Design a protein around this ligand. Structure first.
Ligand code: 919
Lengths: 361, 477
């Protein structure tokens, strides 16, 4: 019990010149006393300069409470000092637990608070670990394993190979994720084959939101005003997927947040300073998707008003059996309809009721 | 031949789109002249003529299918020039003139090739700093470029569709800038330009004889602007003008219709010491009622009531940067979430904040140019957070507002960019018009999707290279 007041005496003597080991002693006490000793563990100066247990004890002490204002800033100053002593400390740091505490503190409403000096030290530590970009890829993998889209954008902006690894996008899409995260991964470069595998995955675990997010990248060309879903082997088709693909002119542009970009700008500055020191869609290709019916297109969710302006519908090389009559009257502006290589048995006469049909196949 | 090219998908952003196959079954239509004569030995260069013929067929969309003529003249098509230059270069009788296949691929790998839509070379005359755009979406697509070689002014009318222009000296004194006002309700489309003597002509593009002169100002004219208070508001439009004596005079678009029209209001923001140079409008809709302008070393922002809302002093800039560059008037101003400022004879760009009225960032174009005089001349900004920078050395810089990084550097097309601004043609597409030196004046039209096209092309070529290397290594293994 006397170790508490003993550490008080220790804090008194460290100010004297040539205090030199006492590092092993205080480490054993910190492992013994979690709360009180760690409150004064800021006295830990540059000592010992290689035991990973010491760094593990440091990070575990920071994370065990993670809600006391002073120990966070004190511990951040301590870890900043030791990484300046040795760059190899950064490797083991991000290896053990650095993400679990860093993401937690920077996402727990770190903004909108008068902690400018606090954020400055955290960004200084960020710019310090930003070196050896392989570590950044590790941080990205860990930041995607959890559902924290607030900091993934920062990692991408600092420069991270999103095609590093079962690639990243398939991992994110396999587990339940947020639309913001998959969007940020698609906007950054990612191999087309990886995106295709991710579409198959999200087809299995039916989720309209992620399906539309991917199809807006694979099979949409805004210049031509055409959906190009040709050969994706989407065994079915739902109007809730093609919904956001169509323009839906009611939608607008709004910057929801900017904290990530500004955070990225200041860590880049700190790294640089440390180095110095109408128009509807008129086509819908559904060919070769191994369909078996299109009955799911009837009084559709916001897709009915958009099909009225379709001027082409490629449905060839599928396996259909009929053409839904309700769709025939909804498609009030077709000119080119393609139905060849399907499996039909009798000509649907009502196909010739379409208002402007001009090329039937 | 086009018969021997296979297509896998029609999606432009695809890894593999076109493929080559020798069907195993030369031809009069596509015979190379060396092969056609037959007194030749096969050389790598021989296929380049066939490739150029393929390019000609693609440009003409198989017009030849159903000493070659001019691709534009023979069959109606978009100019899309540097591909025409490539066709001219490769289709050469001398075998040594044919570029190597690697060279052809490299010059085909340039995103400027896709972005550059049209290029017009004005005949030998005084270069035009003046530039206007047409609001008409009909076949009438033209600009109101103007030059002055004498005391009296002169104007030109150049139609992009017909590629022809008519020029005549109409103004008794030189013109320095122009504005265009459109009132389709009254079907009144008028062009106003200001004389260096200190008066203005307003001229109707429907009838060239509708020429009347406004009231006089003490000193010459620096800039003009025509402000529309959005298309969903009942506010009336105004012709703003900025003179060299700090006079910010407001003409009403209905007042100017009568001869001898009196300006309604005047603001004496500056003087001869700090003359007003330019005006700009806020890109975001949240400040569209707030108009900004660079009155020399001062920046004024005023609401729709013509009362100043904010003043910013540029004399605080030299505390960090060089004094001589900072001690100059601001030439161009871009209004967004952060103000972008370029001043006369300066190679650096300042970033101001509309809230703190304090410097937020510096853009050093000198470093960017040295990476590949450097004085910045003109600016323009678009919705997709990409900024275009015109330099005095004939270079164009592309930056992204998201990261303030360099996207691309454009050169070898003009000697010095004078002005550069966004426009819409008769097909409702948005393009960028750039005017540069060559002294000859050259006009270039660029696609508005230039940064996105650059990024897409870079990613696509990287993907293709990676796939090619991986499959070649797999084949070797
Ligand atoms: C709708 N879909 C279709 O219609 C469709 C049809 C289709 O039919 C075929 C087309 C071409 C080929 N074969 C080749 O192209 N061989 C080839 C390539 C080259 C290159 C690589 C040098 C160009 N050299 N030689 C090649 C090689 C050796 C030869 N020896 C003697 C004579 C000629 C030779 C040519 C084929 F087998 C089938 C394929 C895909 N889709």
């Amino acid at each position: 019990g006397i170790q508490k007041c003993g550490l008080k005496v220790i804090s008194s003597i460290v100010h004297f010149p040539d205090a030199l080991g006492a590092m092993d002693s205080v480490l054993h006490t910190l492992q013994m006393y979690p709360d009180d000793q760690e409150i004064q563990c800021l006295g830990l100066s540059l000592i010992g300069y290689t035991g990973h247990l010491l760094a593990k004890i440091l990070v575990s002490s920071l994370y065990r409470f993670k809600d006391v204002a002073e120990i966070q800033t004190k511990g951040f100053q301590t870890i900043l000092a030791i990484l300046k002593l040795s760059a190899s400390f950064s490797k083991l740091l991000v290896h053990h637990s650095f993400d679990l505490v860093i993401f937690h503190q920077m996402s727990s409403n770190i903004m909108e608070q008068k902690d400018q000096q606090f954020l400055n030290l955290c960004c200084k530590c960020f710019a310090k670990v930003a070196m050896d970009d392989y570590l950044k890829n590790v941080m990205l993998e860990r930041a995607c394993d959890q559902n924290n889209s607030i900091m993934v954008e920062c990692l991408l902006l600092l420069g991270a190979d999103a095609n590093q690894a079962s690639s990243l996008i398939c991992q994110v899409c396999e587990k339940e994720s947020s639309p913001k995260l998959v969007e940020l991964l698609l906007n950054s470069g990612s191999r087309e084959q990886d995106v295709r595998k991710a579409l198959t995955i999200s087809i299995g675990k039916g989720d309209s939101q992620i399906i539309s997010l991917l199809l807006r990248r694979l099979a949409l060309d805004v210049a031509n005003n055409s959906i190009c879903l040709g050969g994706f082997c989407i065994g079915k088709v739902e109007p809730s997927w093609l919904g956001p693909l169509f323009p839906d002119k009611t939608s607008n542009l709004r910057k929801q947040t900017n904290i990530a970009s500004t955070l990225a700008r200041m860590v880049i500055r700190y790294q640089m300073k440390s180095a110095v020191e109408r128009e509807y869609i008129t086509s819908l290709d559904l060919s070769a998707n191994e369909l078996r019916d299109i009955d799911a297109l009837s009084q559709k969710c916001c897709i009915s008003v958009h099909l009225e302006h379709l001027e082409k519908l490629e449905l060839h090389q599928n396996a259909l059996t009929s053409f839904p009559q309700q769709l025939c009257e909804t498609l009030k502006s077709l000119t080119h309809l393609d139905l060849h290589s399907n499996k039909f048995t009798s000509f649907p006469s009502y196909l010739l009721k379409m208002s402007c049909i001009a090329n039937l196949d | 031949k086009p018969h021997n090219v296979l297509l896998f998908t029609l999606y432009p952003n695809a890894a593999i789109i076109a493929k080559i196959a020798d069907y195993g079954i030369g031809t009069p239509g596509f015979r190379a002249p060396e092969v056609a004569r037959g007194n030749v030995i096969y050389n790598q260069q021989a296929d380049v003529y066939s490739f150029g013929l393929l390019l000609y067929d693609i440009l003409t969309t198989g017009g030849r299918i159903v000493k070659l003529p001019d691709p534009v003249k023979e069959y109606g098509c978009a100019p899309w020039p540097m591909v025409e230059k490539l066709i001219k270069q490769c289709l050469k009788e001398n075998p040594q003139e044919r570029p190597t296949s690697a060279q052809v691929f490299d010059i085909l790998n340039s995103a400027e090739l896709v972005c550059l839509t049209r290029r017009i070379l004005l005949p030998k005359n005084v270069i035009v700093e003046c530039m206007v755009a047409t609001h008409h979406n009909s076949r009438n697509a033209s600009i109101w470029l103007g030059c002055g070689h004498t005391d009296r002014g002169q104007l030109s009318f150049l139609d992009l569709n017909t590629e022809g222009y008519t020029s005549e000296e109409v103004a008794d004194s030189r013109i320095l800038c122009l504005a265009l006002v459109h009132l389709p309700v009254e079907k009144e489309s008028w062009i106003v330009s200001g004389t260096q003597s200190g008066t203005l002509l307003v001229i109707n593009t429907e009838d060239g004889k509708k020429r009347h002169t406004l009231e006089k100002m003490t000193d010459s004219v620096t800039c003009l602007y025509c402000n529309s208070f959005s298309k969903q508001s009942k506010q009336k439009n105004f012709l703003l003008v900025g003179t060299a004596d700090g006079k910010l005079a407001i003409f009403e678009d209905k007042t100017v219709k009568l001869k001898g029209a009196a300006p309604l209001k005047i603001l004496n923001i500056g003087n001869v010491s700090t003359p007003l140079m330019c005006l700009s409008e806020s890109t975001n809709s949240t400040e569209r009622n707030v108009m900004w302008g660079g009155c020399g070393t001062k920046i004024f922002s005023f609401s729709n009531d013509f009362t100043i809302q904010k003043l910013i002093e540029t004399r605080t800039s030299q505390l960090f940067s060089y004094a001589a560059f900072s001690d100059s008037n601001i030439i161009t101003v871009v209004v967004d979430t952060a103000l972008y400022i370029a001043k006369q004879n300066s190679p650096v760009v300042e970033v101001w904040d509309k809230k703190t009225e304090k410097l937020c960032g510096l853009i050093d174009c000198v470093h960017f140019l040295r990476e590949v005089s450097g004085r910045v001349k003109t600016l323009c900004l678009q919705k997709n957070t990409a900024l275009w920078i015109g330099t005095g050395g004939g270079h164009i810089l592309l930056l992204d507002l998201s990261t303030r990084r360099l996207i691309r550097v454009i050169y070898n097309f003009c000697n010095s960019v004078r002005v550069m601004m966004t426009a819409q043609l008769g097909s409702l597409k948005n393009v960028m018009l750039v005017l540069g030196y060559n002294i000859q004046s050259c006009l270039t039209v660029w696609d508005i999707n230039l940064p996105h096209e650059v990024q897409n092309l870079e990613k696509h070529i990287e993907v293709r290279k990676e796939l090619a290397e991986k499959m070649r290594r797999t084949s070797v293994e």
